[model samples]
Target chain A: SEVALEHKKKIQKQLEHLKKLRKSGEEQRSYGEEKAVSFLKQTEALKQRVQRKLEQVYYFLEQQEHFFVASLEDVGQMVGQIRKAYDTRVSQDIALLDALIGELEAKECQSEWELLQDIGDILHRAKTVPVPEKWTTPQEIKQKIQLLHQKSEFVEKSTKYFSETLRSEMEMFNVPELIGAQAHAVNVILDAETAYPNLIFSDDLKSVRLGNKWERLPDGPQRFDSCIIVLGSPSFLSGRRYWEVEVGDKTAWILGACKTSISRKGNMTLSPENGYWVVIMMKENEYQASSVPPTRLLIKEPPKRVGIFVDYRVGSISFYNVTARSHIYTFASCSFSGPLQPIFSPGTRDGGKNTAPLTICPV
Target chain B: SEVALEHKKKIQKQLEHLKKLRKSGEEQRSYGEEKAVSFLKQTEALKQRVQRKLEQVYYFLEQQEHFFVASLEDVGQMVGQIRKAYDTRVSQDIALLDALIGELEAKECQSEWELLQDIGDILHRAKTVPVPEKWTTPQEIKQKIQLLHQKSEFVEKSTKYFSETLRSEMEMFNVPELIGAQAHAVNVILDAETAYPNLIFSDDLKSVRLGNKWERLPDGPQRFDSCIIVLGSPSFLSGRRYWEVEVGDKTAWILGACKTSISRKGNMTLSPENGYWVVIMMKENEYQASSVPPTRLLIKEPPKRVGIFVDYRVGSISFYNVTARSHIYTFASCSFSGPLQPIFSPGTRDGGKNTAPLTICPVGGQGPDALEVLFQ
Candidate 1:
């Protein structure tokens, strides 16, 4: 079906180029073997450098942590992430080269098909391997001996210490921040569909509480059979959103956003890594935010009201102590998947001691 | 002679190891070469990834530029710096590998000495090689997919100008270079002993804020017993010294340099005649440079950082509204005086209207000798 000699000539032309690269005789197809061995040797050496570079980068990550000292954690993570990715690419290149060279040395076919197809793709793979673009190491941190070259407003606190806990410096933000919290405020209602049978929602759906009686209710796929929880929507896929919850005299509760796909029937272990971004008050005296190992929050006087602010694009979720006009905690980096739903769970009614309902209050 | 046959056997052993790796026979000592060729092929693949990875990292750096939008500038610079450094390392690896392989393939010799001394170092080169390490790319910022509308701002002024310089969308941080120019500025430490008792100094000697309730203390001569003023040490006279103080969301404060002769006692007038070259912010917006009649400062945004530049040789002390990137005021053509002490005053407690401490910031850029380059 195709011209044999013409395509063989094209294949021969590429072979000549590789042959010229190797300076081997045209005795037989063994030159293909020669070229593969040559390429592998060079790659082996390149791979060694990759190992050394990785070691230095890992060393640099530790230095990064030391410099920022838990302040600029984002920087440390990026280096680690990039190093891992570069490592992956190196392995990919090796595989790509090995497979390409092996096929060059070893692929067989009928004369007509072989000459007609002409191993164009093989040549393409050969062309994919090029002169290296090398990468360097960390001398940037070596020069910047201190962490903060950035400006700071809180002079009275931790001038030498690198702390992101600017809760006390809320005054600096003043109207600029509060205005944001109040401006984009969303009106969320408790989703009774997702609630456990042990929970009850108020008539207007603006509030929720644990029920004294566990009434029989069919466990829908969306319903949390074990943990008492409810969701609210206008599920946020983009932009900024704010909502407040009033937890007056409640002995225990949780407030924040949970991934819509979260397991509804289980011991709802709370964590952002598991798609639950929340702050919990297990009792009157105990409070913490939901991190892997939950972050303990020591609120001097328990806040009667709390404000939650979400800047989805920035991947920020911040909690505020509204009564005290201060910050509580912030989830600074998150990669949200699909839509995120507002989550609310009131503490169990401990013989009426924890019966207070969580109110979705005005901004 | 020198156990030539024994050393030749050692060389033959080394060559056999390489021959086994290649599965090539002892047709010639070419297997030393067969080994070199194999290493080169693998390094060739590694180099391709090196190129691909560099492309991804550079691409990521551009995305970083877009996200911060000049707000978080330092982050962008570091990524660029790291990418360049990594690029350098990749080139180093290729050259090192290539040269190591070339010597293995090409180096030749006199039989007696070559065998006697042996190609031990050549085998060392072969053994120096090991299995590869890999690296990967940018899937991080792609998910963040959108530019911020966090408080929408119009970009027209930069719009026509930006695609030209691709820098027009750069908002508000104009003349930041001028701010950087005045950084490093010289060191200005708060002289704690000279601070009034109502003021408390930071442990680093970088900041001082007012203590609302007076802490009783034994009055000393150098201490300011009345006005809420503090002096920065290393009094200056021939060179320009610069420093910045963060007056975060503060409602009122005064910043400048004063003559060492300025009175430490009560009720000093806020003017130059009293040897005070200062600016005071009392109203939430209006600011005044301390003068015979204080010059009114009409500012657009209340400044968060006030950078004070004292050019003693040029006879100038200038104040900068760092947040807004604009000039506040300057004391020009001021007559001669001995070493002028850098001065600061956190305005009154004003019923909690103004209580923020003035923080001395670390200069981001090194300032050339202030007197080294004179404009006039």
Candidate 2:
């Protein structure tokens, strides 16, 4: 309820702010329309200059073609100018795309928040009110309302559960390495269920598998492929500690009790059999190869009060944040017995010592 | 006036239709706020499905990595499906973009045309009406209005010219040979006088002298040493033409005359002595080699009215479309002094029967179809 109230309050304030923005934006659109006329006038004046320049250049080139030809070097320079000019014109196009996107997003978020508030109110009412008496009062209407409330609450919970879980899962991920950064190698197999969405459809009991490199790809909202460049060096975590932060309502689940190492040059390398989870790098161009390697992480001992789902065929080793209702990673087609312990391969920073030992959920 | 009226009538009808649509659209945006609720619900459902699919794929891949790592070939089908999914999304996006463009274009054209019409009306009034005898007319005011009108006209002219010329050029162009479809091949050349507006720096040169395989490009809009292409290849023409169609006025100019040889194939070959021009073959992605043995261009006759301004400097022989006020390539730089007669390059349809005798323009020997080829 505290978490819910906090999100509600924050979202409510955001919605109010967005409403004001939308109100002001309408005025801005009007102003933009008015200003566009002058811009058009300026554009027109520019057009003539464009025309004359066009004519002269054409004639010059034509003359060269005919009788007064310049050298190829001269022509190449001219071509570059042409390309630059084209780019400039394209940039000045009257697209209004950025403005449109902002407004559209604001509207979408506003509406979504409103829906959430309504659902929350309904849920509060259901929780506070007494249940309808079926036999004593013989009130069918109240009973129906009670049933509907229950159904709505179920839907809301399911929706909230997925969204919150996914958001935390995403936020737990560290920002990818910078461009031209060395490769950070992680070598722990991912749990099959968490790694690939297509695993469910694979009916044959004979479990199939994919490589670590292959699994790293297509990891995004837009089916983005990731590039994992070999850093050509080991990653030594001598001075660093694997850590995690609680981003939202979700409890963070991190695993780094085993050995982890980084090279002198910020290159990372780790060897977790069955598969490792490390943030290698992020790129602006999603499908392009990873531009940098993972050097930093937030990790801790094996989780307690954790929920384990054993997929026999998949051989997945998945750790879940039961309170947060999120899966940390589904280690792919891996064979791991219950009560698996975390390991962060150790070396001290200025003789730095680790505090917490590995812990497990009670049987 | 009828053309203008027709345009107005079309716009009026469109305006009326838009008014009706706006009524409905406004109602929907306001009353149908609840519609987004459904969308939100749908988004939730879709999110779960997407997440599940993602997880499933990841799980299977991880399993494969650990134990039964399938061969790349065996997983080829799955990879193909993923790629196909990506492509489908791209197509959907492109289609959406096309719709957005259509909507935007309609609005833009409407606004531009309205402005054009307003300026045209003012021009008509100014032309018909006489000045008042008593009042002293300010020179600056007249200049300002004239400038405004001129500006509008230029905008109208430029937008129309590029689109129309591109369409017409594609017709004359042998499209399939260059690419599967019609494409632009731009060339840029330099000059000092026409440096104010560098946007439409001349891409098409009138006369280009031949050079070795590579020739330095001409200077004008941007700084450069050479054009990065060979002669006789399709390229973008970027430069001022001899003439242009101003906003309300569509006039033509004679770009002077040019001459060249008719080879078996339509490859504009240049000699090393004329390394002024470079041709780009897009397919090969390389510049044409210079000093290719000049296959003799059998000239039974010479160009009559159209005199060839032979520029050893720029390796090109140009044909100007006096009607359209643009450059038409007859052949690249190759030389043949004429007997003061225009050599008619007979097209295949009129190969033997018809000869539209090339009439020589006295100004600088301007004529049509200087060299007749086997095709015609």
Candidate 3:
């Protein structure tokens, strides 16, 4: 009875608030529409929960009426009491939802068929209240209502969680367009000349892996003596462009844009202020944005192939988990001067566990 | 008189609406604060304009009072007429602004100091009106008012534009801190193995210039045979990094990030899909982001040295006018499956004029500090 009362009051108050807000027409839709939709969804779930409880209460009472060994008048009196309580609980829920559906009809933002189905189901279930009873003990009916109540509570809690999750996802990433940057997808090749002496580039020039010792190859000032990393062959001067790197199962890897004039030798702090914007995977699945004291990245699954997108004028660089088609992170308002090069480091081989060569896959 | 009444009525309506809104406590401050501040600024300018006209009116009247051969009573009466009309025209403007200031005080989002300055100036100008008469021709007075009116209109329009511009710059980038990315600045060197045969790099590996003929050198898989471009010797595998390239006066050049597995022989699209995220300057002052149709970039002054910044995980590559400490462009949301290299084209020599080698500069003291050295 308390559950039914709560649902009815909540729905009524919400509908009234909705009406008030619509009348004002002063605020923008984007400001409050999300909260309104979330509220409506919660109300719908609660209505279903209450209606199911009422149906169970009616079903048990009707079954008891038929088996009772008593005068017809006595049985009738018992059935009448049951019917009054059931109606009092069920009728209010049905009426409030009906009003809610009517309010939603004019809005037309979402489909009405689903809500209509719920309404039809509740109304059909309500008809079973006044019935030919069957033999049933009072304890048995109480047990059945308790079981249904448990189920209803589970559904209600899950629905709340589901809505909160949906809301968070909708608020994620305010970028202009994530998929649009795919058109700028590029094939990044390994820059062998830029590779660390302790790293080797594959024949096709698409892959680079950590080597045991420094190789006796001709080197330049840009070559990294202590750090194991390499730059992409081409530098991005401007425009929206995208590139993908297959990090594979490597536990340690680093990928992002690096300035052409960045530090190449000795000691260097890898951070944005040092003219580096990169995400690093140092330990097993430990990821971070390469700012000082590195900002930790929240990654559900280790990305095999990471997608990188850059918008020069807008000044944003976003990373995507290529396989999942989900965003990983975004570095916003980055300042640049000359050309930017895609940079990566497949961390030093940990006795072959992290030996997967950081490869440049063709778009 | 009609103009005076309209001004008074407009100010009264605004004040009444402000009172009603403040009482409700319903509306958000962020939503309308900008427009409100803009409105107050315009009002201050208007008050100053009106007060100036009143002062002019009184100045002319006083000059006439001294020069007139007529009876002092007649001159006095003429002065009275001028005084009434000038005060009537200017008094409402000053009074409305006083109320506007009071309303703004409760909001208190913007600085009141500047508004007070305008108010003080208006009050000072207003005191000059009354007890002044002039025998000036109607045409001269009309011309003077018209000139001042035109000047005031110009100021008002320009002020609106300036305010809008200031607002946009404030909202342009919402990054936590723009200067934090400079810590990752890496010195990029030309990858001689990947350079075009006709493009030559300097000894210290800091600069590159166009050469006359293809050099007889050992070739490898990463070398480019067709395009007159070179890849940076060091590849950025991770972290935020910044570096500068001095393009000098080269009329035509190509610069940006490129896939290490890019096409090495024959014709290439040189687009992002083909492993290039570049902005090109093909003609004098003509710049473009190397998208399919090439996005046109508007550069006021050609940059001698460009600053390149990259954020690996976020997948961003941005260019800056190093000397001006201004942003040039950014390539956003790039998907990288492998390591990325710094690719550049010094361009074919323009007979010898385009001979300036592309040089890289060190990241000085961070963002603005580095820019100061560039400007010096």
| Candidate achieving the largest TM-score | 1
Ranking by DockQ: 1, 2, 3
> What is candidate 1's CA lDDT for residue B316?
69
* lDDT (tens digit, per residue) of candidate 3 on A1-363: 454344334434443443343333223223234433443354344344434433443343233223221222333344345444444444444444344334434323423444333333332333222221222224533443343333334334433443333233323324434477677887778787877877878899888888776454576776887777788867888888788888888989889998888887658888777778889998776889876677788788778888887778756677888877777877745456567888889897888899888878766
lDDT of 3 by residue, B1-376 (tens): 5544443354344444434433332232222333334433433443444345434433533432332213223333444454455445434444443443343333233344433334334333333323222222234333333333333333233233223322332332321133554566766677777777777776667688887775534666677877888888566677676777888778888887877778787677878889888878887878988877777987887888777777777777777776666777766666767778788888878888787788866677744432222221
Model 3: docking quality category: incorrect
DockQ of each: 0.01, 0.01, 0.01
Model 2 DockQ (Cα-based): 0.01
Local accuracy of candidate 1 as per-residue lDDT tens digits, B292-338 = 76778888888899888777665767778888887777777677478
Candidate 1 lDDT score at position B206: 77
TM-score of chain B for predicted candidate 1: 0.49
How do all models score by TM-score? 0.30, 0.15, 0.28
